Design a protein around this ligand. Structure first.
Ligand code: U4W
Length: 293
């Protein structure tokens, strides 16, 4: 029976909000992936997402699922998905999370690119608001000494597709694994991560790559380079060019997050200030996004 510690506070299985099974109904499948497996559900009525643990699973799998529930249950911030509760005493086991109907950010960006059929589907301001949303979640993690270890568009969710959408950090799998190779998010990692010491400046680095994902509208970073090619490229001083039509001031935020030395990268409070500035600059927000023909 593991304990989990966050912000100086210790908690364990008995501290999770166990929701009676009978109160939980699955509505439909949403999908599966590195994050595990998730459904839309209802509680009691409260609409939720439901993550599930396979009944056929290892002991470490069980401990992983428990630790996921502990980690997410202890965060308290408007840009990190909430945990409504858990159902660990019935099988298959469930973790109940805030329903994020816009789905993951990477897919939303790819699917919502301006096209002749939808030429104003996104504007710079939409992208800067997503960036600000995730920076605010990261600033919370930084201030609570929690290193995320995989800040990327694939790990962010949106409340809804339309106007008023709020982005939130939706996955903590890597952090869970280290709380405790080919799968490592190499394209998101700074040179120093290859002494292997992490800090919140490693998350600053990763946030710069997420900014590149956002302002490229969902491209894979380092187009054409493999993991090892990226590693050698960034270690040598190599950096991505700005995404298509990216305003200079937004690209300058990326390039400061990618300073070789970690002390030279901004903390998330500074990143936020700089995103706020870009957001107020008419020349940035009046810049047209590219049309994908
Ligand atoms: C058109 N498009 C509209 C949005 N729709 C949705 C809506 C909600 C969701 C969805 O799961 N919403 C969630 N609401 N609350 C959640 C909490 C945890 C997770 C797991 C997760 C976290 C994450 F950061 C990224 C993920 F893709 C999946 C997911 C959710 C969804 N999920 C797909 C994402 C694509 C992935 O490959 C398979 C799971 C898709 C997909 C279809």
């Amino acid at each position: 029976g593991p304990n989990y510690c966050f912000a100086g506070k210790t908690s364990s299985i008995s501290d999770l909000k166990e929701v009676p099974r009978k109160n939980i109904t699955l509505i439909r499948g949403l999908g599966h992936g590195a994050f595990g497996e998730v459904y839309e559900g209802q509680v009691s009525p409260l609409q939720v997402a439901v993550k599930t643990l396979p009944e056929v699973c290892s002991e470490q799998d069980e401990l992983d699922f428990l630790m996921e529930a502990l980690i997410i249950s202890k965060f308290n911030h408007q840009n990190i998905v909430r945990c409504i509760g858990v159902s660990l005493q019935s099988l298959p086991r469930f973790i109940l999370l805030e329903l994020m109907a816009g789905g993951d950010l990477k897919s939303f960006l790819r699917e919502t690119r301006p096209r002749p059929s939808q030429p104003s589907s996104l504007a710079m301001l939409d992208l800067l608001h997503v960036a600000r949303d995730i920076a605010c979640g990261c600033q919370y993690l930084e201030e609570n000494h929690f290193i995320h270890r995989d800040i990327a568009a694939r790990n962010c969710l949106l409340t809804c597709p339309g106007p008023g959408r709020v982005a939130k950090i939706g996955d903590f799998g890597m952090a869970r694994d280290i709380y405790r190779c080919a799968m490592l998010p190499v394209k998101w990692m700074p040179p120093e991560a290859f002494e292997g010491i992490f800090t919140s400046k490693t998350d600053t680095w990763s946030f710069g790559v997420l900014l590149w994902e956002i302002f490229s509208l969902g491209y894979m970073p380092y187009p054409s380079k493999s993991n090892q090619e990226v590693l050698e490229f960034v270690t040598s001083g190599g950096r991505m060019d700005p995404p298509k039509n990216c305003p200079g001031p937004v690209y300058r935020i990326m390039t400061q997050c990618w300073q070789h030395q970690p002390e030279d990268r901004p903390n998330f409070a500074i990143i936020l200030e700089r995103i706020e500035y870009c957001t107020q600059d008419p020349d940035v927000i009046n810049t047209a996004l590219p049309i994908e023909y």
